[PDB]
Design goal:
By secondary structure, this protein is of the alpha+beta class. The chain has a single domain, classed as Replication Protein E1, Chain: A (3-Layer(aba) Sandwich), CATH 3.40.1310.10. Helices cover 38% and strands 32% of the residues. It has a five-stranded antiparallel sheet with strand order 4-1-3-2-5, sandwiched between helices. The N and C termini lie far apart (41 Å). It is found in: Host nucleus. Belongs to the papillomaviridae E1 protein family. Residues 1-138 are annotated as: DNA-binding region.
């Protein structure tokens, strides 16, 4: 049941979910098969719980696939994160991939940075320090 979502995620976003992930505040969350109207309102729904949010929405096999990097106001466990997302999106935890982001990957940092600059993502809050430091420029 995890492999199937990983496969769909790579087909949809163009990269392995494992390229981005390694209680805590920072979590990478992929929610599968979400209702379009619900997904469109995710930004507003999750805002009261975070300090930072990076959100993308793309269609997949099952419906809308939400990919978001979140920094919560309060530290949370994987289970607590899933419960909160399920309440907001009406999707069970079995249709989610939730794992802490990689914090020492220049590739992962670059991914969030670039997609963040792009209008394809909905970003709010203060950008995490690790993304800024690891992003290579020149």
């Amino acid at each position: 049941k995890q492999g199937a979502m990983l496969a769909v995620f790579k087909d949809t976003y163009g990269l392995s979910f494992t390229d981005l992930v390694r209680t805590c505040t920072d979590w990478v969350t992929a929610i599968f098969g979400v209702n379009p109207t619900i997904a469109e309102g995710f930004k507003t729904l999750i805002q009261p719980f975070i300090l930072y949010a990076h959100i993308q929405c793309l269609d997949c096999k099952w419906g809308v696939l939400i990919l978001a990097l979140l920094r919560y106001k309060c530290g949370k466990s994987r289970l607590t994160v899933a419960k909160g997302l399920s309440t907001l999106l009406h999707v069970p935890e079995t249709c989610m991939l939730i794992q802490p982001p990689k914090l020492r990957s220049s590739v992962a940092a670059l991914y969030w940075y670039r997609t963040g600059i792009s209008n394809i993502s909905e970003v709010m809050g203060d950008t995490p320090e690790w993304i800024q430091r690891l992003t290579i420029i020149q």
